[PDB]
Amino acid sequence: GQWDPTLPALVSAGAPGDPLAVANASLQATAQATQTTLDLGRQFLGGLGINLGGPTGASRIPRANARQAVEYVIRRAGSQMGVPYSWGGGSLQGPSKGVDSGANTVGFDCSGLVRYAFAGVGVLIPRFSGDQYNAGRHVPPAEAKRGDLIFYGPGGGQHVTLYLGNGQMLEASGSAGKVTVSPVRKAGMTPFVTRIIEY
């Protein structure tokens, strides 16, 4: 089968025309996300003693600090362990109320969590999991490494997780009801993983 059997076979939040997609496509929202991501990247690079001047954004990270960026993203996602699951939940700075079933629950969904995590190093990935799938470089799962994104469902539309290495993935899981670390699941995986930051 083409879905992860352990999670509902639903296309995830922010898919084309859904409430979350339309909310986010405004010029003002788009600009707010772009600037906030830039602000966070400045914060990350500042903490390393780097302040860029003059005139996804993975290219803004010096090669020297690409590994560190991956570690910071994983740390950031890890900081959210135990936060509740909420469909459509998440801002670039933390959990938020979601949409639909998530409209009154502060939390994260699968794609919300990983977008929050990457934004910490100034990389803005798309809101919808199926878009995230195409936001980096496709790599055969046998060649996956710590930091890659793992996807489930047709076109990665169902679910997305952050591979830790160690046969583990960090995920906002509808079955767990929370942000958790789980063994990597084979059933329902897309053909590729996606590398957002190269190292």
Swiss-Prot record:
Q: Which PROSITE patterns does its entry note?
A: NLPC_P60
GO terms for MF: cysteine-type peptidase activity
Known InterPro entries for this protein? NLP_P60_dom, Papain-like_cys_pep_sf, PG_Endopeptidase_C40, RipB
Classification via Pfam families: NLPC_P60
The biological process GO terms on file are: cell wall organization; proteolysis
- Entry keyword annotation includes Protease: yes
- The protein's Enzyme Commission number: 3.4.-.-
Signal is among the record's keywords:
yes
Active site per the UniProt annotation: C110, H159, E171
Where does the NlpC/P60 domain start and stop, copy by copy?
Answer: 67-199
Q: Which UniProt keywords apply?
A: Cell wall biogenesis/degradation, Hydrolase, Protease, Signal, Thiol protease
Q: Which domain of life is it from?
A: Bacteria
Q: Which family does it belong to?
A: Belongs to the peptidase C40 family.
**Subunit annotation:** Monomer.
Function noted in UniProt: Peptidoglycan endopeptidase that cleaves the bond between D-glutamate and meso-diaminopimelate. Binds high-molecular weight peptidoglycan, but does not degrade it. Required for normal separation of daughter cells after cell division and cell wall integrity. Required for host cell invasion.
Name of this chain's protein:
Peptidoglycan endopeptidase RipB
Q: Origin organism of this chain?
A: Mycobacterium tuberculosis (strain CDC 1551 / Oshkosh)
Taxonomic lineage: Bacteria, Bacillati, Actinomycetota, Actinomycetes, Mycobacteriales
Q: Which gene encodes it?
A: ripB
